Amino acid sequence: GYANRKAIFGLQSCIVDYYRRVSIDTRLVQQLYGEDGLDARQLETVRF
Amino acid sequence: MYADLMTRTGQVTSLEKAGLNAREPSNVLLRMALSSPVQVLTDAAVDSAVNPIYGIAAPTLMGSVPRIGTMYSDIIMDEKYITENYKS
Amino acid sequence: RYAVASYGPTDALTGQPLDGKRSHGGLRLGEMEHWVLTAQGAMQTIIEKSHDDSDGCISYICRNCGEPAIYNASHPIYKCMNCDVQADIGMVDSRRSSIVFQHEMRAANVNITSVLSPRVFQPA
Amino acid sequence: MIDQKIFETTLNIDDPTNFCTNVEAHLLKELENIYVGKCFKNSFILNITGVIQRSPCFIMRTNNSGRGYMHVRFSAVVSYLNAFDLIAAVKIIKNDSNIILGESLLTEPVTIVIPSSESQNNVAEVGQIVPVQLANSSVYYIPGRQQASATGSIFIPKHTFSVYHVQEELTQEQALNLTKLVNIIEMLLESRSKKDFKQICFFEKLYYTYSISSDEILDLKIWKGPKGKEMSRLKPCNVLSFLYDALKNKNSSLGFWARPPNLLKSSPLAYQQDQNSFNATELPIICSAEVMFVTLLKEIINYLQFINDLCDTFNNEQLIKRHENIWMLIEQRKIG
Amino acid sequence: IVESPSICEGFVQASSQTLVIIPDNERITSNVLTTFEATRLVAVRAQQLAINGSTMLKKKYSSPIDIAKQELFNRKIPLLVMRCIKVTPEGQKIVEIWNPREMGIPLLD
Amino acid sequence: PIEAYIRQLLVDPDVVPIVSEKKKELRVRPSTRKEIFLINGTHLAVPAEAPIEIYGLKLRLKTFSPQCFMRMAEIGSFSPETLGYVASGANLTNFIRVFMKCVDQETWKKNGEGVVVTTKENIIQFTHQYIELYKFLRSGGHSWLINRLAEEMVHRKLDREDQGSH
Amino acid sequence: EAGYAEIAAVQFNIAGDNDHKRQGVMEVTISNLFEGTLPAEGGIYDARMGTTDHHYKCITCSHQRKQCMGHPGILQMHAPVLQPLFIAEIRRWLRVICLNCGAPIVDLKRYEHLIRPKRLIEAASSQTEGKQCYVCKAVHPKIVKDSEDYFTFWADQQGKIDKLYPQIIREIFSRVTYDTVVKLGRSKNSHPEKLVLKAIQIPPISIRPGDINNVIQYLVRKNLLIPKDLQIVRGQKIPLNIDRNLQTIQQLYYNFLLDSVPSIMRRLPRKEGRIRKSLLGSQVWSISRSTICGNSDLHLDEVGYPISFARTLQVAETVQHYNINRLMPYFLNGKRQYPGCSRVYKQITQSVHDIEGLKQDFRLEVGDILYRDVVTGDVAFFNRQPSLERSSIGVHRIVVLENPKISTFQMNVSACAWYNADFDGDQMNLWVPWSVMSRVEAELLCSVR
Amino acid sequence: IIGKVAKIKYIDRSVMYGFDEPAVVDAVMRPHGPNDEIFGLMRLRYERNLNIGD
Ligand SMILES: [Mg+2]
Ligand SMILES: [Zn+2]
Ligand SMILES: [Zn+2]
Ligand SMILES: [Zn+2]
């Protein structure tokens, strides 16, 4: 609980904008979310 | 997400009160909500801090809702469609 | 087990329901529940629960100076005790606990001025 | 003064679907229902002229009501009242020991409080219609009120004037600005000629600073009114002709300008001299031509409005006799 | 010298903005509604139907939610999506306007 | 009436700081804390009641941007006196400079440009001109002028961003 | 007439005397509390500051208890006081400026390269005792903090000791120019003159309904004791009773604001404080809780809901032309049969009516809001604490259990993986959305699928 | 369950049974406190079988 509340108050301002970037109100945290721009619920494990 | 946040400024910042100060210094309301409101509020007053409302805690401490999810994009009435298709 | 109502006893300070079964108040949607609802994007549920069902109210703020204003549709009052001739009052959806919170900060000689979102106009 | 103003506001919309069927008509209707006949932003809105530009109908974001809102930037015909302004018809509504209350019956709704300390007052009995002049104080425009709050007293003509020392020429841009006040003067003059000449003569003889010697009317082909005293050998000049000539850059506006009580305030006459030959009781005010032109012009608008609206309010001799006490108080206080 | 504060500063009221709409051929955001956007559209339409009740839907439904969902699916919803892109320091508010009656709907029924 | 009353009334605005030289002439106590200057040019404040001697009066001719006047007209609720004061400050008008410029000489100089008056008669003239200038700013004149100016400037800005553009 | 608006930014500043004088709605002048059954005018309970009892409305906004947010008052202090939260800041200003002419002692240009938050802090950190002024020729003393309280300052000039009374500090600070403030980093709104108060703000009744009021009353009572025409000059000897009265007033104010940091600022900090308990969390209505239970006949997206709870929680249906026929059977049942209703909101009268108090209405009028019972097929938010994952709150389709002997929330065992739950005594919350907007959002976003 | 009025004409300082499950009044008595002042003592009983969720 101590670690969860400090992680959320440090990370909660990160929000996906209209470019799929992650930013804090103007300021880039990621150029693309997850570096691939995908949702984690929409992934398939596939062999190359 | 953790590493990109902690390394955003070119230095490794922490998930403590000190790290929040480095990344979001002007977000007093976020910073007040984390650990120590009285010290943060006192510093904000003498510094004349301007706090833009963004994220989750800053809207929440002001009684509003975050501009996130369903609230991210705003809806406007289709003025032209209604005139052609609807009646008073 | 517990299930309460749309209404009941209310705290005099925060304006929120009382605590739990014994006081016949409500149950708590805590800090971690708002994290989950925010993570899900369910913002209209946060309005329904944390505003409509807890203490949500209307705060009136003058555009010209950012201070709380006084508005009353019946018995017409439209005034601001900082500018008082150039008042431009806009209603903001707030909650009573937040207005009390801002009153407490002003009691500590900290001035809270709210910059309202500016008017936007079509260029036509 | 009736003028044009531009306001910004936000209107709430309870039924966005029905509102958007006719946005311009509904917008004008709501603006008229909200702002016409009230005080807002240091002015009194008389009419909603139009909507310069607006916003899309957004949907309220911080509540689950589904209602809309719209930013509107609209032009309105408003009124503003200044100090020393002449109101020719205010009705006394309450006369007690504390204060006197009056409500103006004109197109500029203002309620005037009147102190009882002055001997001019305490004579306008309840129900009388007297002309008053506002004090040298700002007229209060409390938001949401249907009148304006002002202070003033029953108008007694003053025996003191001012001298303006013009050391700066009039620019052509300033002349093009002043021609609007010139046109207002023309409109007031041509509206005055349509009224009753006997009423004009009586009301100008009544409020003349001196006492008119006998029936004698000067006609300048644009302003017609009884003649008063002169000032030795000094001759007045028409301000309107001087301005129209200064449009052609043919006259010098420098020197000592003055309007002594000998002139009729409603007339466009003025005294320009190369020397301070006026018997002023105060230091001449150093300024430019624009300042003095604006002051004298606005004075002429004020007194033209005063006289014309006095004649409009008092149409029959019955009200003249009913107000003969006010007229006696007016006539008694003149310098010999 | 830095003298006393003047009226030129001390303004609390932010200056008004001009809504700058990106031309339709220069829009960068996706032509597919997000789940958040579709949910918001359906919720707003359902609430407005609870207010007014006037719809151009041919079929008959007993709930505002069903009518709103079928309006979204049949491309008859009288709403627009405005995606606020940027607020310029010189006053402009650059946005993109999207017509949900010609976008891809993620929801299912 | 007395010169003390007038020269104490004029000290109220943040404009017109005063220069002080320890002597026996023009003793004034302001009605609030006032930032004054000394001969040889040193800037010091004095509390709400301090006997300061008036070597002379220096009004600083404030300068602004037309953007400030545009913002005030955008708000659209300021008094005509404040509107005209800022308009003269932003050079949209010239009333402050045309009522004044009774400057004696370059008797005292520093960073801020303005009107310096260091003598008996011309201090009286400066006070009279200040009184007349603010009586003009509050009068019926310059109320029509400033309102017309603000309305036409904002309307032209709207038209040029609306009709002249797209 | 008040248009819709939102807050885009918030500014923080130090509130001086002028702010309190503008924002205050009345001046506190008497220590009487109540005049009969009404609050005493001029006291700390004056109705111009708001109403908390149903016996009266607010004089200022003419609202009842619920719609009035309170309005602040003014208390004119007979002797100036220092601001309790900014005492440290006061110290930083006493160690930099000259105490006799107001000019700076440190070299301002020496600290120009620093960032403006740190300029004053690092300029005051340097030793300044014994320094000589450049414009008035005065030796700067050392400002020693009194060790027996949080607010008293002394000036020590080579062993000569003086007590810096708040009026002396105010007179010293009012001699500072705005150029000094700006060149020392602080903003024009942070002039040190605001750090000494002669008019304090009596907080609105909305934040002290009904311990804090005791402190305020004691403060007013002791303020009245101080002579109204008291004057303090640097070095003047003070009568002992007056000195202890000034000490009592300042200590009362300090305990009113920062006691053990009843005080205003103790309401904020901890988990039970204002921010974490009232703002970040919330007590809510229309919610239920019960022990959870297993049921293998329920689908994974279904929750078993007792009928007794289904008739407590309600769903708000707005009566229109497309649902008048469906909503009519709910209206006829009332609170006697299931499924029924409990309450109707009428737009014609703009009020809420119980369903037993109306029986002459043949049908409902379009525009009314019927609060009906929860039925099978309704969506419900279903939550187990602690909510550590995104699936800790999920939306389930309600199945109402008609057996009156069942008091548990029943769900399929394969649905336990969402909530990290089991059936050894866990309790889960359940609230049913009633508004259309939240009830749309439950289906489309928050469904457990 | 217990009626109690304070004399101002009167204000009702009563006690209402705020529980979902009905009870049965098992014992009622008016004992004397440490200050020799009357207080009301009531015992309420509930017939508790084993039921789902126990
Ligand atoms: Mg367990
Ligand atoms: Zn205001
Ligand atoms: Zn109130
Ligand atoms: Zn010194």
Contact criterion met (CB < 8 Å) for D16 and E80: no
Q: Which amino acid is at D15?
A: D
Give the CA distances from residue D127 to residues D124, D321, D322, F158, in Å, rounded to whole numbers and listed in that order: 8, 14, 11, 48
For G243, other C-beta atoms within 10 Å of its C-beta total 13
Q: Please name the residue that has the structure tokens 């009245």.
A: G224
**Roughly how many angstroms between the first and final C-alpha of chain H, as a whole number?**
28
Contact criterion met (CB < 8 Å) for D56 and C124: no
Query: Angle at the Cα of F96 (from F92 to F99), degrees rounded to 5?
Result: 130
Instruction: Give residue C38 CA to ligand 1 midpoint distance, Å.
Output: 26
- CB contact, 8 Å: D60 with chain G? yes
Q: What is the resolution of this structure in A?
A: 2.7
- CB contact, 8 Å: F42 with chain G? yes
Min Cα distance G49 → chain H (Å) is 28
Which among C40, C55, C105 is the top mutation candidate for probing chain B, defined by the most B β-carbons within 10 Å of its own β-carbon?
C105
Count C/F contacts: CB-CB distance under 8 Å.
14
- Chain F residues in contact with E15 by the CB 8 A cut-off are 71, 74
Q: How many residues does chain G have?
A: 449
Distance, in Å, from the CA atom of G287 to the CA atom of G314, rounded to the nearest integer, reads 10
Instruction: Give residue G135 CA to ligand 4 midpoint distance, Å.
Output: 6
Contact criterion met (CB < 8 Å) for B56 and C38: yes
Distance, in Å, from the CA atom of D271 to the CA atom of D260, rounded to the nearest integer, reads 8
Distance, in Å, from the CA atom of F136 to the CA atom of G424, rounded to the nearest integer, reads 86
The string of DSSP codes covering F46-66 is E-SS--EEEEEEEEE-----H
- CB contact, 8 Å: F163 with chain D? no
Instruction: Look at residue G282 and give its three-state secondary structure.
Output: strand
Distance, in Å, from the CA atom of G431 to the CA atom of C10, rounded to the nearest integer, reads 19
Instruction: Look at residue D137 and give its three-state secondary structure.
Output: coil
Query: Residue H16's beta-bridge partner residues?
Result: none
Note whether D309 and D203 are within 8 A (CB): no
Instruction: Give residue C114 CA to ligand 2 midpoint distance, Å.
Output: 11
Contact criterion met (CB < 8 Å) for F78 and C86: yes
Q: Tell me if the bond preceding F51 is cis, omega within 30° of 0.
A: no
Note whether D154 and D130 are within 8 A (CB): yes
Main-chain phi, psi angles of F75, to 5 degrees: -65, -45
Contact criterion met (CB < 8 Å) for F141 and D298: yes
Going by beta carbons, is chain E in contact with chain D, meaning 3 or more pairs sit under 8 Å apart? yes
Instruction: Give residue G292 CA to ligand 1 midpoint distance, Å.
Output: 10
Instruction: Give residue C77 CA to ligand 2 midpoint distance, Å.
Output: 14
Q: Please name the residue that has the structure tokens 């009501």.
A: D65
Min Cα distance C10 → chain H (Å) is 16
Going by beta carbons, is chain E in contact with chain A, meaning 3 or more pairs sit under 8 Å apart? yes
- Chain C residues in contact with F75 by the CB 8 A cut-off are 64, 86, 88
Q: Which of D15, D17, E66, D25 is nearest to B85 (CA)?
A: D17
Main-chain phi, psi angles of G350, to 5 degrees: 65, 55
Cα-Cα-Cα-Cα torsion D36, D40, D45, D47, nearest 10 degrees, comes to: -50
Instruction: Look at residue D51 and give its three-state secondary structure.
Output: strand
Residue of chain E with shortest Cα separation from D60: E44
- Chain B residues in contact with C101 by the CB 8 A cut-off are 61
- Chain G residues in contact with F43 by the CB 8 A cut-off are 177, 179
Distance, in Å, from the CA atom of G101 to the CA atom of D157, rounded to the nearest integer, reads 53
Q: Which amino acid is at A26?
A: T
Tokens for G428, please give them: 């889960």
Distance, in Å, from the CA atom of D10 to the CA atom of C119, rounded to the nearest integer, reads 8
Residue of chain F with shortest Cα separation from E18: F161
Give the CA distances from residue H5 to residues D148, D328, H9, in Å, rounded to whole numbers and listed in that order: 55, 74, 10
Q: Which of G381, G380, C44 is nearest to E42 (CA)?
A: C44
- CB contact, 8 Å: C56 with chain G? no
Q: Which amino acid is at B29?
A: L
Query: Residue G254's beta-bridge partner residues?
Result: none
Going by beta carbons, is chain E in contact with chain H, meaning 3 or more pairs sit under 8 Å apart? no
Q: Tell me if the bond preceding G386 is cis, omega within 30° of 0.
A: yes
Instruction: Look at residue B6 and give its three-state secondary structure.
Output: helix
Distance, in Å, from the CA atom of F15 to the CA atom of F17, rounded to the nearest integer, reads 6
Any chains having at least 3 CB pairs less than 8 A from chain D are B, C, E, F, G
Note whether G369 and G317 are within 8 A (CB): yes
- Chain F residues in contact with C123 by the CB 8 A cut-off are 161-162, 165-166
Distance, in Å, from the CA atom of E9 to the CA atom of G178, rounded to the nearest integer, reads 15
Which among G444, G446, G449 is the top mutation candidate for probing chain E, defined by the most E β-carbons within 10 Å of its own β-carbon?
G444
Instruction: Give residue C81 CA to ligand 2 midpoint distance, Å.
Output: 7
CB neighbour class for D251 (10 Å; exposed up to 12, middle 13-18, buried from 19) = middle
**Residue E72: its H or E element:** helix E64-73
Min Cα distance C114 → chain H (Å) is 44
Distance, in Å, from the CA atom of G55 to the CA atom of G38, rounded to the nearest integer, reads 8
Note whether G56 and G38 are within 8 A (CB): yes
- CB contact, 8 Å: C32 with chain D? no
Instruction: Look at residue F118 and give its three-state secondary structure.
Output: coil
Instruction: Look at residue G202 and give its three-state secondary structure.
Output: strand
Tokens for G436, please give them: 């259309």
Distance, in Å, from the CA atom of G300 to the CA atom of G416, rounded to the nearest integer, reads 9
Q: Please name the residue that has the structure tokens 């207080």.
A: H39
Distance, in Å, from the CA atom of G418 to the CA atom of G449, rounded to the nearest integer, reads 11
Q: Please name the residue that has the structure tokens 């009928």.
A: G307
- CB contact, 8 Å: D33 with chain C? no
Q: Which of C71, C29, C24 is nearest to C53 (CA)?
A: C29
Q: Which amino acid is at G81?
A: V
Give, as one character, the DSSP assignment of residue G206.
G
Q: Please name the residue that has the structure tokens 């007794």.
A: G308
Distance, in Å, from the CA atom of C43 to the CA atom of F8, rounded to the nearest integer, reads 59
Note whether G339 and G373 are within 8 A (CB): yes
Min Cα distance B41 → chain G (Å) is 8
**Residue D172: its H or E element:** helix D172-193
The crossing angle, in degrees rounded to 10, of helices E35-51 and G436-444 is 150
Strands D111-115 and D129-134: what pairing?
unpaired
Note whether G250 and G398 are within 8 A (CB): no
Which residues have C-beta within 8 Å of that of residue D156, sequence separation ≥ 6?
D120, D329, D330, D333
For D205, other C-beta atoms within 10 Å of its C-beta total 16
Distance, in Å, from the CA atom of F102 to the CA atom of C38, rounded to the nearest integer, reads 67
From the CA of G71, the nearest ligand is 3
Residue of chain C with shortest Cα separation from H20: C2
Which residues have C-beta within 8 Å of that of residue D60, sequence separation ≥ 6?
C93, D66, D67, D68, D69, G4
The string over H4-24, giving b where at least 16 C-beta atoms fall within 10 Å of a residue's C-beta and e elsewhere, is eeeeeeeeeeeeeeeeeeeee
Q: Which of G99, G366, G114 is nearest to G234 (CA)?
A: G99
Going by beta carbons, is chain E in contact with chain G, meaning 3 or more pairs sit under 8 Å apart? yes
Min Cα distance D59 → chain E (Å) is 8
State CA E75 to chain mean position distance: 16
Q: Which residues surround ligand 4, an ion (CB under 5 A)?
A: G 98, 100-101, 133, 136, 138
The string of DSSP codes covering E1-52 is ---S--TTS---SPPPEEEEEPPGGG--S-SB--HHHHHHHHHHHHHHHHHS
Helix, strand, coil percentages (3-state) for chain C, rounded to 5, are 30, 30, 40
Distance, in Å, from the CA atom of G190 to the CA atom of G13, rounded to the nearest integer, reads 7
Distance, in Å, from the CA atom of H37 to the CA atom of H30, rounded to the nearest integer, reads 10
Distance, in Å, from the CA atom of D131 to the CA atom of D86, rounded to the nearest integer, reads 8
Note whether G245 and G75 are within 8 A (CB): no
Give the CA distances from residue G15 to residues C119, G197, G199, G251, in Å, rounded to whole numbers and listed in that order: 28, 9, 11, 20
Instruction: Give residue F91 CA to ligand 1 midpoint distance, Å.
Output: 77
Which residues have C-beta within 8 Å of that of residue G63, sequence separation ≥ 6?
C72, G51, G57
Contact criterion met (CB < 8 Å) for G290 and H51: no
Distance, in Å, from the CA atom of C53 to the CA atom of C16, rounded to the nearest integer, reads 9
Question: In G, what residues contact B, Cβ < 8 A?
Answer: 6-14, 85-86, 89, 117, 186-187, 189-190, 258, 261, 265, 268-269, 273, 275-276, 279-280, 441, 445
Q: Tell me if the bond preceding F13 is cis, omega within 30° of 0.
A: no
Contact criterion met (CB < 8 Å) for B54 and A13: yes
Helical residues (DSSP H) of chain F, grouped into ranges: 3-9, 66-75, 80-89, 95-99, 120-138, 143-162
- CB contact, 8 Å: C79 with chain G? no
Question: In A, what residues contact C, Cβ < 8 A?
Answer: 5, 8, 12
For E33, other C-beta atoms within 10 Å of its C-beta total 21
Residue of chain D with shortest Cα separation from E81: D58
Nearest CB among G6, G435, G438 relative to D62 is that of G6
The string over B16-51, giving b where at least 16 C-beta atoms fall within 10 Å of a residue's C-beta and e elsewhere, is ebebbeebbeebbbbbbbbeebbebbbbbbbbbbeb
CB neighbour class for F70 (10 Å; exposed up to 12, middle 13-18, buried from 19) = middle
Which among H15, H20, H21 is the top mutation candidate for probing chain C, defined by the most C β-carbons within 10 Å of its own β-carbon?
H20
Distance, in Å, from the CA atom of G76 to the CA atom of G92, rounded to the nearest integer, reads 27
Tell which residues of chain G come right before a gap with C–N over 2.5 A: 210, 261
**Residue G212: its H or E element:** helix G212-225
From the CA of G59, the nearest ligand is 3
Contact criterion met (CB < 8 Å) for F44 and G178: no
- Chain G residues in contact with H53 by the CB 8 A cut-off are 290-291, 293, 406-408
Instruction: Give residue A35 CA to ligand 3 midpoint distance, Å.
Output: 53
Note whether D285 and D162 are within 8 A (CB): yes
